[PDB]
Amino acid sequence: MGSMERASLIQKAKLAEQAERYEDMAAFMKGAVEKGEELSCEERNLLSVAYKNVVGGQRAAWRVLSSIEQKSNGPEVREYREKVETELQGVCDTVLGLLDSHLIKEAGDAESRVFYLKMKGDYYRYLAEVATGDDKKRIIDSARSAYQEAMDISKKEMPPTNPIRLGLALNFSVFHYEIANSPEEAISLAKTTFDEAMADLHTLSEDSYKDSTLIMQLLRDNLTLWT
């Protein structure tokens, strides 16, 4: 996308979202990141939405194929699961590469840095979902370390109702439950996050209240499933 203007890439990312063309969306936003400028709040959301949808479809397909493969145990199901897996890993590596070159290092404000570190934890988590053995351990630790740094910044720099702080805590709790085999840590984190947000709702306008309570309901939904 090197020959397209940054503003045109952003505009086309928005059109691609409206058209539900998420692969195109992600390609436009990769091009925008590669222009080398920092991303605004809205532009960070476009980057995240694009890749979440792309990798979300890959993850759903991988789970379908992995389930069929487990039931079977010719080479076709394994071969095709491996093909989808390699594609998924490539998307995760692409996102991680954008974060490392150079989104995180240029992000000084807490909101941007936390947003990118949450992404980093998420894409290492998606790598961990398909990893095996003694590559899986290092991938898990990379996810944990990214989430932990984001958590440390968010607790110092953002109110407990901030939607990025809340979503980070939600996703880190999912990491603890599903990846790290730490369901008690997952439940603790979700409970403390929910309670501290509850106690800060009084400070919020109606619109901020709506966003924060929506994520708090997702924390509660997990707590209900886990307890």
Binding site: N45, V49, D122, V174, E178
Partner: peptide, 9 residues
């Protein structure tokens, strides 16, 4: 369980 859906701007 459920992570941030984050599939719509």
């Amino acid at each position: 369980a459920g992570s941030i859906p984050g599939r719509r701007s």
